# Entry
Amino acid sequence: KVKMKTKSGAAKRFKRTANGFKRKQAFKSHILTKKSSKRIRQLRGLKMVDKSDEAAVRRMCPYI
Amino acid sequence: AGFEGGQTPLYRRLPKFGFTSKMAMTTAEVRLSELNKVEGDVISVATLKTANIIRHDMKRARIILSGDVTKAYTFQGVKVTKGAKQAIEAAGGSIE
RNA sequence: GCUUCGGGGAGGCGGCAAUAUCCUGUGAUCCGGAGAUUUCUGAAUGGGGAAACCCACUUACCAUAAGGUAGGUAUCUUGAAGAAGCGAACGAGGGGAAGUGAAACAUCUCAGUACCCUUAGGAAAAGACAUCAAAUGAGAUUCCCCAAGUAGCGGCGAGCGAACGGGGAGAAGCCGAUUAAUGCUAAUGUAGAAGAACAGCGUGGGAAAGCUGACCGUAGUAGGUGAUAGUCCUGUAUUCGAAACAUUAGCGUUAACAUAUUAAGUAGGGCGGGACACGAGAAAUCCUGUCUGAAGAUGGGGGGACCAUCCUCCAAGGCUAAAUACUCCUGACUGACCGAUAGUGAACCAGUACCGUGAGGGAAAGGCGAAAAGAACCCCUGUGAGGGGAGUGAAAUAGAACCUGAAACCGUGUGCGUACAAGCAGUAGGAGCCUCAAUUUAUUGGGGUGACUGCGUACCUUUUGUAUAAUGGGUCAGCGACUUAUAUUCUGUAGCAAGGUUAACCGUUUAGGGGAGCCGUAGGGAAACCGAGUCUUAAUAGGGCGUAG
RNA sequence: CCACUGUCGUUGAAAAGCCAGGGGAUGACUUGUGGAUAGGGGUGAAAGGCUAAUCAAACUCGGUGAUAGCUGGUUCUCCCCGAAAGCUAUUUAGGUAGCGCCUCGGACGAAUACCAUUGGGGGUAGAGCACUGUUUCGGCACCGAUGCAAACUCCGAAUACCGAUGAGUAAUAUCCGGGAGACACACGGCGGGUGCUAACGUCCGUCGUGGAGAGG
RNA sequence: GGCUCAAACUAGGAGCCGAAGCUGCGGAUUUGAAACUUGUUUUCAAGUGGUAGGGGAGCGUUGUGUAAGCCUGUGAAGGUGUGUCGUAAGGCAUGCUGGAGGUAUCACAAGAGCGAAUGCUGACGUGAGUAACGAUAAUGCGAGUGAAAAGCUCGCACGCCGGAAGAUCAAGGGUUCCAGUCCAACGUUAAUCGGGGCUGGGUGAGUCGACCCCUAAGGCGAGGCCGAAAGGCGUAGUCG
RNA sequence: UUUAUUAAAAACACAGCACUCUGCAAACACGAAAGUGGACGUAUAGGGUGUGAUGCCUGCCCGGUGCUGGAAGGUUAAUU
RNA sequence: AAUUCCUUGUCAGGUAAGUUCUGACCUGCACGAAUGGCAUAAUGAUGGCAGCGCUGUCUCCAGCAGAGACUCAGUGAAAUCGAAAUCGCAGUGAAGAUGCUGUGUACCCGCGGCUAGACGGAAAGACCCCGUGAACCUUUACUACAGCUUUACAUUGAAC
RNA sequence: GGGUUCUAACUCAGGUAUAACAAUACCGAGGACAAUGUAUGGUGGGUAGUUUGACUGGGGCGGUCUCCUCCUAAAGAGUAACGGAGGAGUACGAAGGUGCGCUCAGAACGGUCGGAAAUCGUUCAUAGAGUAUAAAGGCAAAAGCGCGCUUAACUGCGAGACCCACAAGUCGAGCAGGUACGAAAGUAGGUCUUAGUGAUCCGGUGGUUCUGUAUGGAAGGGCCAU
Ligand SMILES: [Mg+2]
Ligand SMILES: [Mg+2]
# Structure
């Protein structure tokens, strides 16, 4: 049977929450000496996917 | 899908995170309000399977406080939360 | 077309397509079984060759002349028997693209696909654990529904994509589950046979339709018959036949082949590749070109690097039905499939005409009427073509180019307008004329025409913007473009409702059964884990995310 | 056998010819018949020539319904609403995506708009030399007269924008969701840069019209 | 056009014309509001230009059921006129033609609607009775036959070729060869003529050619070599 | 000789010249290989390249890139 | 100069007059010695320049012959084509008008000519640009591969 | 640890016999070489598959592409041009924190070398200076200049805003813990501010119980930091 395929790379970046999707933030992989400790604090942890982007996230991960 | 016109897409702007746990694939959470599908008074993983509350390949089960229990049950090999445990013994059952 | 064995019973000598001579109850034509004959080419097979031809050798017999009849003579394999070639799809195996996608492109995708090559069988392959599992363990292979677009793989891009297990179909394990004959017994098939019941009246060319009244029905929505038939014909329901041959089974028997005895150049390893969903990856497992190389039950293989423990199973011998794949074909039946530009390319003398050196490409083209009753005869004409009478027919502008007979296009006739007037040709007005009707009589109403006045630069497309001198269309007719399948989300509607719903399957089949699974009912967190909470934190603070299907 | 020149012919008598002239004409000659070399291959006294009227990779069939951000086309009717030609990004620039703008459904209910009164901040028009520069004349760099400036300001509006309060008027604003289209814009004003205060020029801002709007 | 104490200009005034604007009258429609309240009724208010595009309501067509119905030779479908009804798509009736089928209603399913795609097929226009009738070697007349004669036959004369435009072949074709008969089509006109139609006839070999014997180039090739397969090569030979 | 079908030439070829390769199972070329051509030839031969009768002639540069020879040293694969 | 841009260089010759030609100079943008240099008899349907002869090439066309064209009879195409009741001018206007404005002119219809316009026909511009189009060619672009070559192992051994 | 020799593998496109080809036998010549398979380094337009940007008053050429400052910019924000002008791709363990203290450029007068201008004294001097660096804005409570002690150039966060298509970016009181300086109230999460920058993937490193494919480990993965 033919089914919709998940974007397997989008599934690795997005996770289902109750009313949205959670995500990690960018700019934390490398180049971290020059960054202030406020930015190192506040770029750590989960954000929610933006309301303008959750349509694309739903199109990309249809089974989550 | 996932194409922004050439701008690097959102899912590739962002980092991958987490790992997938195999243990979570075989643990089933059971609500107090599903227990009306159980035949008898004993509540074990096998009994939940034959009630079809959990999938037949689930190894573990957890009973959580979602609805209410209408009769006294005997939960044998399942994990029971704090509120679920108090509600179970308020209805008159026991956990072992 | 010859013989025979069965069927059948009155016509017949295939079609276009008739005519003649004839055959036929001394049983024809026709149908079914069997046999006989069976030119030449083609595997083509005596040699050769531009297929349908040329040239032979040899044995036996007959002839006496320059031959005739019946044979034999290819190659390969196996020890006389086989093979060869052809032909649907499906199987197994040896080789194996690229366009494309990645919005470029090289890894990757396409795809082990197309194609080429080899070779089977009614199926093939696989198959009995050196298999999984980690549960109270299960117990070969194949196929279907789930698991699941999950776990993974992946320039972690585009994509690719399991398994465990659950529910089904089918079940089987052996060491001869082989092949080919023959002979019985049974059944089938290949021709056939019987097979109910309607009349009157009116209309009509014709009755099956109308009106009236009957009948049959284990037979009433069949195809025909001059219009629509249960009772007119062929049929249908039902009951049924086989001398001969085939096929399927069961049995018996024969003759061919096969019949391991537990597995070493093997398992494992180095190097290079390949296959595993898995692209070298931390990469198990399988396969092997190259180089090596055990233990052998006090042993060995696997459990996804690897080690220990535990479980499990014994490779290096062979086999094995079903459930699964397919359709060149045969039979029966079916269709919210087509109806002549459709449906096969092909309803028709089509893989034809035609085109091409060739491989190959590849059409157009159906219909009188119920019955030819297909128009004797006469007339014009050239014994032509064509027509007009006569005749036939219900009908002949149904007359053979024949049902109906649209449009483009081209005539003839009638009415009105039009030869001093400038353009998308109409429109709004409007005189006159012509013609039908009324009307107690030139007035209205309908129709045709349109002098004269006003206004007025086609349509489509594409554009900032088109009369545009931008695009497209000579015209007509016919055909020609948002589908289908699955997944998914939202909306409506219906049923059930904290529940809803089954899938494959089974089913004497839209039912009933089948609960495997899926969605909902809880979230938080990477996760373990906890749970109306949870995460972060030293924090019980703060903060994040949470608190009718 | 060839093909140098010209006329003709060019829907030809002909998909390469005719006519009149021209060259080789015992040679590296011409010609018959049969054969050989095959597609990234052949063959080539070399022009990328020729390989069946096909050649910078033949033809046929197949992969194949190649792909085509491009062009064309897209068939009945009526009712309601109704854009955009912008910003951001883009191997992007005539494509696409988020946002803006359109529509439909739901939620919400004055939170919206207009005006009056009122609380704000500003550095523009104007203006001016207090700074930075620049300019002229006089007196003796400074004094006094006198000009000018996008990147000068001692000053400084109107408007506009952000608030408050209050009437009336009004088919408001906002949020969540289904479906878009659009991201070539043009002109006339106004304020400018650019150009020549040239352009039916170009680039912004801002209004109106056209786009998608007939009528006078 | 034409205009001069304007029909120009300036400053004033009064009349009038002038749009699909506004008003009047009739009708329809969207939304909202009020009440017999799913059009059951009346009103009222605000609306009703529109491309891309979104939303809403319908028409027709083929087919299935409803339908063993209903209609239909006292005339179905289709064709072609007319009348009539609806906002439209369109419906209804009916004359003529036609001669055997059609289909109400409500559901249901679409090969469901065409003017454009230098769209596809067929038919038929315009150009236009226009260009042309294919070597400028050439014809004239008399007879004959015939429906008909420039073109056929016969005759006389004329002209052209004559290293061909005559003759014999090979190749290729395949009956075109000869006679009779016919003239629709074919022949670039007509045709009595023909390489056209139809019917008959015609090809005679020891010596000519083929076959045959022989070999060239070049093929094929018991065995043989080589190659994943397919195949490639090659000896003896065997063809050519 | 050539662009069959818009170019016939100054283009190609040519006899002649030079360089260079090749000792024969030649180099070289076709081919997967077998088998071939070179050639039943043998350095006065055969291949490749340039130049192009003939006359007079053909200067300088070995840094670059090739080619030929050399190998002291540096670096360097699989393997181990 | 088959090479020279400036450039028709300069000077000489030829002509009445010569951007070409011939000779020479050297200031060679940017000749040069086997991608040969400079010459060269003969040869060439080769390039340039100059003469004689000859001429309808021309001044400047005339006459004549044949074949068409034209008329009649027979046969009977073509491309094109939204539809046409299809005039000029000056304006206008998607910016060059038969079709719009104003105006001027014009009775209806052929035939022989003709080509100024219908941005005439013909060919989805080859120029130019664009497309994350194609092809083929090049190379010290990238990445591969054939081929050629190196070494290890195997085929592969013995003695000193 | 290299040569030399041998022959028996292997080779012969040598001779003789086997009809011919080939093979075979013998002889002869070579010979552990050659040659071939696997692996490997080099060479390799001989051959393939492809790439070779965009903006742009047509394209090419040139220039540019990200960030900061001023203007254009129409007195809120924003706002284009291949418009006009300039900077950045750093620096600093002090040039950061704090407590305390200070005030600059110039001009004139006096004074040894000594001047136009060195250092010293005086008088005016709101900044005509400085601010690591461009410009703008700012700066006396100095943000400018010294000195002592120091590590707040902290860890966990953060109400609330600004900006914004997203991804990002910016400001931030307050709370907890630890700290520095101050007698203290306090101030301090870098530097007057606005440039000094680069997503994801992949890989490395320091930590961590989170996971760990029968089980215990481990490998690998995750989380935090880089
Ligand atoms: Mg008819
Ligand atoms: Mg050709």
